[PDB]
């Protein structure tokens with residue numbers, strides 16, 4: 140059985156690095172992370188110092 | 204990193220109050236709740252006494 | 268077996284009351300109405316006197 | 332010909348009042364506003380004092 | 396309040412049995428599981444021995 | 460001209476049999492049923508005895 | 524209250540005429556038809572003599 | 588950079604002519620119109636004399 | 652088994668004729684073309700002489 | 716690089732067997748078939764003898 | 780009240796830089812730009828010299 | 844007439860480079876490649892050595 144958690148990663152650099160940010164967090168706290176599906180992307184502007192790219196992913200992990 | 208939990212709140216009063224019901228539950232058990240996105244709304248009729256409005260939300264919270 | 272009818276209710280008050288308007292109509296003419304799913308919402312402006320909130324619902328009823 | 336502008340209204344009270352907020356703004360600056368279609372709803376939490384309901388609408392107006 | 400977890404069940408037999416696989420896992424670890432909504436189906440081929448049917452479900456459970 | 464009715468069939472056995480349940484009902488009451496399109500699938504759990512698979516279909520029939 | 528019926532009109536001429544075909548049928552059998560929304564278009568080829576354009580519409584009518 | 592404006596054109600003749608109606612309006616008031624994407628089609632019936640076909644388009648234009 | 656190819660037809664006349672353009676091409680090179688489903692429509696403006704209507708279709712054909 | 720072909724399989728038995736029908740055809744003619752994603756399901760009724768279940772899949776295969 | 784404008788940015792480098800291109804243009808001409816939501820991405824090939832990455836964003840700005 | 848092929852490119856570097864990977868493959872085997880539309884993005888994790896970014900594109904090419 141796989142389960143997915145819905146995470147939004149952030150980066151001041153790129154959409155790819157923002158996806159990595161979310162996956163890194165998942166891998167910190169979950170075993171058997173196997174894939175991620177991008178579900179949205181955006182840019183936070185008017186409450187940060189530098190533009191912040193955001194990539195939201197369903198991160199899938201194998202249960203057990 | 205933000206994470207979202209997918210909650211359906213309920214109310215005998217309104218769709219807005221049903222959204223509040225879900226957010227209240229999130230705030231009871233989670234720190235740093237920052238926003239909610241409505242993903243569906245409906246009304247339960249034929250297994251309740253009074254119509255029950257339901258509002259399903261992705262409730263976003265900042266991790267750490 | 269359930270069947271759904273696609274109804275748009277209206278209200279000069281709120282989206283919740285517009286949903287009730289549709290459900291009330293279904294309950295007038297149908298037995299065993301069991302739930303409703305919101306599929307769209309809108310506001311009619313430039314052919315009514317007061318803004319009219321509209322809520323479109325699939326109203327589900329149990330057949331037999 | 333109709334044109335639509337994509338506006339997010341806000342309210343500390345309800346999704347309906349947040350929709351009104353957007354429509355009111357459109358009517359302030361546009362002639363012949365004729366309808367609005369709800370495209371999203373959400374709640375801003377962790378950068379406001381009180382929860383703020385938001386309703387995003389395409390507000391349609393007749394050109395000329 | 397209901398909460399949903401996003402699970403992908405697997406089966407070498409059918410899409411229905413793959414849905415059961417996910418629900419069974421939810422029922423192992425959660426109380427008050429009340430319904431499941433199918434959100435995707437697929438078949439894993441080129442890293443398994445026999446075709447494996449997969450059914451992804453939002454499994455809803457009542458909180459408390 | 461074709462018309463469609465939106466029916467949810469149920470089965471304690473499978474998603475395919477739940478689709479048949481809806482189609483059977485359509486064929487009981489309608490002439491010239493010609494096809495069905497699956498629009499959703501789900502499983503009712505916590506108000507039935509055995510899991511009940513549900514398949515919602517637009518059932519198309521030729522008018523006249 | 525408005526209700527919608529989901530009709531597929533057909534024409535050997537055009538998508539517009541296929542939409543008219545559905546609306547004409549609605550107007551034959553329903554009072555207070557007020558609008559139609561196109562939901563799909565297609566072309567039937569390999570079971571007709573000439574290509575047949577099809578336009579599927581939700582036809583809305585005012586109840587009462 | 589391209590920008591899009593969301594326009595609904597109308598015609599008593601066809602969906603194609605309704606799309607032209609919107610594009611013509613864009614070209615009246617905008618320079619460097621480069622393409623249009625159809626996003627919806629419909630027919631206004633019960634507040635016009637003759638059926639009016641409507642085609643909603645995102646009309647893209649190159650900025651500068 | 653059916654297979655679909657994703658083709659965009661073009662016409663200086665209409666969306667219907669643009670759909671025919673794609674289907675004609677499919678029929679030139681494929682046997683047993685049986686139906687087409689419209690998936691998008693648009694208009695190319697700023698790199699053609701006359702507006703060019705485009706209709707994108709999944710063209711289905713029976714294999715063997 | 717992966718490529719996908721869009722195939723509709725058929726079965727007089729089940730949606731799962733209809734998916735297998737499409738995958739079997741892909742495996743007959745393609746090397747390195749690796750997965751399939753269900754994109755639609757339906758039932759052909761009024762031009763076949765027995766109901767025919769259909770499952771449309773994107774069948775993915777690794778290029779080279 | 781927030782308003783959104785629908786802009787497609789371009790870059791010969793990356794999808795992230797194409798998003799920046801659109802946001803930069805918005806910030807040139809608008810006050811209080813607060814966020815952007817990616818709605819589409821693509822690559823222009825056969826009318827440019829080098830591949831051009833394009834990222835379409837709804838750029839949100841606070842009115843007043 | 845344009846045709847599209849549905850390709851998933853891969854890269855250990857970025858979503859942009861994964862899109863290039865797919866386009867490069869199309870250009871190897873097809874003439875008159877004119878544009879690509881991103882339809883999905885993801886990251887393969889638990890069967891590769893380094894995270895592999897994937898970008899799925901419809902690659903459009905002009906027929907003849």
Ligand SMILES: Cc1cc2nc3[nH]c(=O)[nH]c(=O)c3nc2cc1C
Nearest residue numbers: 180181182183193373375814815816
């Ligand atoms: C990055 C980002 C910020 C946002 N802020 C937001 N802030 C807000 O008050 N309302 C919103 O709807 C909203 N949407 C956002 C979406 C994105 C993608």
Ligand SMILES: Cc1cc2nc3[nH]c(=O)[nH]c(=O)c3nc2cc1C
Nearest residue numbers: 244245246247257302303304501503
């Ligand atoms: C409130 C609500 C109840 C429902 N009950 C339901 N009960 C059921 O047996 N099948 C369903 O598909 C179903 N859907 C529902 C959807 C909503 C929005």
Ligand SMILES: Cc1cc2nc3[nH]c(=O)[nH]c(=O)c3nc2cc1C
Nearest residue numbers: 308309310311321366367368629631
């Ligand atoms: C309330 C409402 C009115 C509308 N009127 C409309 N009137 C019209 O001529 N064309 C339309 O597309 C249209 N859409 C509408 C949508 C909504 C939600």
Ligand SMILES: Cc1cc2nc3[nH]c(=O)[nH]c(=O)c3nc2cc1C
Nearest residue numbers: 181183238239240372373374375385
């Ligand atoms: C109200 C609201 C705020 C938001 N803030 C947001 N803030 C953010 O940093 N990223 C987001 O994606 C985001 N989305 C939002 C969506 C909504 C509906």
Ligand SMILES: Cc1cc2nc3[nH]c(=O)[nH]c(=O)c3nc2cc1C
Nearest residue numbers: 436437438439449750751752885887
């Ligand atoms: C079963 C299945 C396997 C998959 N594998 C996959 N493997 C991969 O490398 N990229 C993918 O996008 C991908 N998608 C899949 C989807 C499904 C439904």
Ligand SMILES: Cc1cc2nc3[nH]c(=O)[nH]c(=O)c3nc2cc1C
Nearest residue numbers: 245247430431432500501502503513
């Ligand atoms: C089978 C089923 C039951 C459901 N019950 C439900 N019951 C409920 O109170 N709210 C819901 O949203 C809901 N959704 C359902 C969906 C499905 C598919």
Ligand SMILES: Cc1cc2nc3[nH]c(=O)[nH]c(=O)c3nc2cc1C
Nearest residue numbers: 564565566567577686687688757759
């Ligand atoms: C016109 C048309 C015919 C079709 N026939 C069809 N026939 C069939 O056996 N399976 C299908 O999925 C199918 N889809 C169709 C869709 C359209 C739009």
Ligand SMILES: Cc1cc2nc3[nH]c(=O)[nH]c(=O)c3nc2cc1C
Nearest residue numbers: 309311558559560628629630631641
């Ligand atoms: C042409 C058209 C008119 C409409 N009128 C409408 N009028 C209305 O009161 N409510 C609606 O939702 C609505 N929708 C419409 C949609 C279309 C496409």
Ligand SMILES: Cc1cc2nc3[nH]c(=O)[nH]c(=O)c3nc2cc1C
Nearest residue numbers: 622623624692693694695705821823
């Ligand atoms: C006809 C048409 C042309 C287009 N050109 C385009 N040209 C471009 O540089 N970027 C685009 O996104 C784009 N989209 C188009 C869509 C359509 C429907």
Ligand SMILES: Cc1cc2nc3[nH]c(=O)[nH]c(=O)c3nc2cc1C
Nearest residue numbers: 494495496565567756757758759769
């Ligand atoms: C099985 C099937 C047959 C169909 N036939 C069809 N036949 C037709 O004339 N028009 C259609 O739109 C159509 N759609 C279909 C869809 C499905 C899923």
Ligand SMILES: Cc1cc2nc3[nH]c(=O)[nH]c(=O)c3nc2cc1C
Nearest residue numbers: 693695820821822823833878879880
């Ligand atoms: C970059 C891009 C160019 C395009 N050109 C295009 N050109 C065209 O003639 N028709 C189209 O549909 C089209 N779509 C496009 C989409 C994208 C994303």
Ligand SMILES: Cc1cc2nc3[nH]c(=O)[nH]c(=O)c3nc2cc1C
Nearest residue numbers: 174175176437439884885886887897
């Ligand atoms: C990269 C990727 C791998 C995947 N693997 C997958 N593997 C699997 O067994 N089931 C899946 O649904 C699945 N989906 C995937 C999606 C993506 C985007």
Ligand SMILES: [Cl-]
Nearest residue numbers: 145197209401
């Ligand atoms: Cl989710």
Ligand SMILES: [Cl-]
Nearest residue numbers: 273325465529
């Ligand atoms: Cl419907």
Ligand SMILES: [Cl-]
Nearest residue numbers: 337593785837
């Ligand atoms: Cl828009």
Ligand SMILES: [Cl-]
Nearest residue numbers: 657721849901
């Ligand atoms: Cl496709």
